[PDB]
Amino acid sequence: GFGGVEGKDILVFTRQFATMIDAGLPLVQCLDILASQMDNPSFKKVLFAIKSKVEQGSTFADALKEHPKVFDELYVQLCAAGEVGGILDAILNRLAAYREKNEKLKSKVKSALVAIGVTAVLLLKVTPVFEKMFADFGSELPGPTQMIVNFSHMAQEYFFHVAGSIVAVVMSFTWSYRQPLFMPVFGPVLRKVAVARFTRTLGTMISSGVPILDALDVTAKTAGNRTVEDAIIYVRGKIAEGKNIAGPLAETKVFPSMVVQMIGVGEATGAMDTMLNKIADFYDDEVDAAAMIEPVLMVFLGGVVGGFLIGMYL
Amino acid sequence: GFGGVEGKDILVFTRQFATMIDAGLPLVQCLDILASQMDNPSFKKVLFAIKSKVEQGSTFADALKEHPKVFDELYVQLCAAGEVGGILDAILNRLAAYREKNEKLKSKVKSALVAIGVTAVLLLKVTPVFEKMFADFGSELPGPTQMIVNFSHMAQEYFFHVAGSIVAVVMSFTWSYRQPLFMPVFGPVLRKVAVARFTRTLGTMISSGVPILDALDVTAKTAGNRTVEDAIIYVRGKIAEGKNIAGPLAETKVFPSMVVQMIGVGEATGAMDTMLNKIADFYDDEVDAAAMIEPVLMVFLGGVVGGFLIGMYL
Amino acid sequence: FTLIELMIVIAIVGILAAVALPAYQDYTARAQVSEAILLAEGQKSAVTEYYLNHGKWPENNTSAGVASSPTDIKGKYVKEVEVKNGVVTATMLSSGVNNEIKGKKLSLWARRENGSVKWFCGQPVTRTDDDTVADAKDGKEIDTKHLPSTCRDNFDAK
Amino acid sequence: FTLIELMIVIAIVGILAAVALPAYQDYTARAQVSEAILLAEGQKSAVTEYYLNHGKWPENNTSAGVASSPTDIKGKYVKEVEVKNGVVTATMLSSGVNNEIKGKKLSLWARRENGSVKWFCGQPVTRTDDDTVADAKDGKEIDTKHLPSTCRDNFDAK
């Protein structure tokens, strides 16, 4: 018996492979880099073993088959479908987006059938069960009827409470579904997520040995947010013209003073790889902290429960 | 009407004065340095004005009196008590520790009625509500009584469950209050805080113009953690013998590969001041952000809930 | 950083007890008085018979044919019950009762209906003549708030 | 963040009073009617004797030899008791009673057994002949729900 790896940790590693492979590095060199940039041993250890099979000439799909407890049949088949069709790059991008959506969805049920499914049944009916069970403590409560009425009339009068229960359900479903003119002012710009991804990708390609300009040309093709893609094309154009990396960044609001000042050190130090790796880890942890997706649950959780109980009493 | 300054910003500045004054720099030169190293204008601006009074010959206590909205009566009196008794150095160290405890205590109530208050009620009773909900689903559960007993006996037998609920509460309160044989292995070593303080102190004395070795001799007397003091005495001893600063650091785990690589660039560039200032501000921001403070919550969260449910079951 | 759910819920049960304190404290007193009333009654029989058979109100317990000793008609909250000229007064003990009702009392008295009598229940009264009583005004009467709706009778109720 | 134990427990006692409200309100009315019945009875004696001695039902209170004035046979919840041809009706006061029973009444009537009579208790009735009465149908009868199991008699009960 062996377990997989965390949702976070699959995420980081699938993202960073998709990024390196779409950069045109050799698959074995992609594998080496993410292993060598890893913080947990179990990841660095596996990825050396996956790479060891790839250097014997096996496909990535067949190399991941050595860890079926970590990469399930659906993951390998996605890889292998990409390898068979000549689309390994775009299926890894798909898998990275998949792993990101999976981790975010995990944090965000749990915060405040897997665990998400069992916890989501369990939260969706907790209250409405409470409710039915206070309303089953005997007869002649607030709002009931006597049991001798005809059933249809008894059930229709309680319709109030059947309704307050369904509304309670709809609410906890909404919290679980949501929760996992200046025209340019209205466009979605770069977020925290998109800066964290950028920084990880660049930290990744620099630590591997790619120059800054080669890493930026790859990244400018793999950036999801259009306004950031436009930002990064401008940063790369500025750097390729001979402007200093920290100065192309300083023109764009999305990079704080600390980010620019830290990058500006990294330029003079030949340590940009790592400046970016520490920036990226800082951002990835700020991202996963960012907490209102769990407090607003609980607001609607007990607020609806209490609204039911109040409802019939009155 | 004028406001004070932030808890963070009093902190940084009281620390860095205590550090410079305990170094034996002249008080006016201490004042100049922290003003000249400041990032906010309002701080650099005041500290030029406090220094302007000190160069007219006034005490630091009487110079801070020009900003009574920033340095309260209790702060000045501590300074003035230090100045009257010949202990200005040790009362500034006390004030720096005070300001650090004040900022940390501020972040840490406020963090998460705001959102923290609403989320903390909401987490503290979630479980104990679930619990009362499953135990209100009728009669003749695990451990109950029949309703016809006398109330006092019924309530006393359940005392088990009333107790398992309170314990659940105490636990989630502990996680919210805390959280905001190899004998040497058991000693508290250097933390993030202690590295951030060290780096700020050194960034501070180097930017002011002190050499590395003069700054290390002061710092080795003002380091609070004993194991770090022992580390820093070894770093200073190595440097004074003619070993290169990055090489004395590289022997000690508390300095990452990059802190060392960055310091190693600073040695060859004559920019150790700039390097240390940016290292320190990176660390100070990592400190105030700060991942095990959230995983251990959840351990006690569901672990206590489950302990209750099992408790009456049996 | 965290633990406020345990701190607030221990402090809402604390204030819940403080709000439930005066409710249980008059419900409680009102309960201890309802007995002084039961101990006072059931002695109406003796008094009624004595009056109808003789046409004069029983002067004291012995006359009424009841525990010759007032203190022998006590209870948990009742320190006694004395018959004074047909008027039966019940005294509240000093131990085991509210706080503003101990050592306090009420009275039951009757009136000639001619062939029968009618009983009243209320705050302490003294008998003047065979068909008239008056407030035993003195300061030891059980406060109106502690008396049932059935025991709000005035000295001149008819 | 915290305080819901005080808020819910103050709101469960509030709703507990609302559930305990109708129980105390019919237990209460049912109690106020049980007396109209006691005031009605004890007047059976006069009526019985009058009938057995004369063979005719007493026309009114005075005939039956009772407080010549109906209003003189009142109570706390009883506004009076009138004897109308052997039928004794009790009226519920307007003050101090439930709400759906005030100004409402019941009747006690008897029937010749020949040598003796048997009494009935139920909703208001009128006497037709010496051995027959009928529903005093008019809308002021105390509702069946407020009447004891011993006072559910119909106009033609034998």
From Swiss-Prot, chains A, B:
| Leader peptide range in chain numbering | none
Q: Which residues of the full protein are shown?
A: 71 to 407 of 417
Cellular component annotations (GO), alphabetically ordered: plasma membrane
The similarity annotation says: Belongs to the GSP F family.
Disruption of the gene: reported phenotype: Deletion mutant show missing type IV cytoplasmic dome and disc but the cytoplasmic ring is still present.
Instruction: List the keywords (alphabetical).
Output: Cell inner membrane, Cell membrane, Membrane, Transmembrane, Transmembrane helix
Q: How does it assemble?
A: Homotetramer. Interacts with PilB.
| Name this polypeptide is given | Type IV pilus assembly protein PilC
Main localization category: membrane
What's a GO biological-process term for it? Answer: protein secretion by the type II secretion system
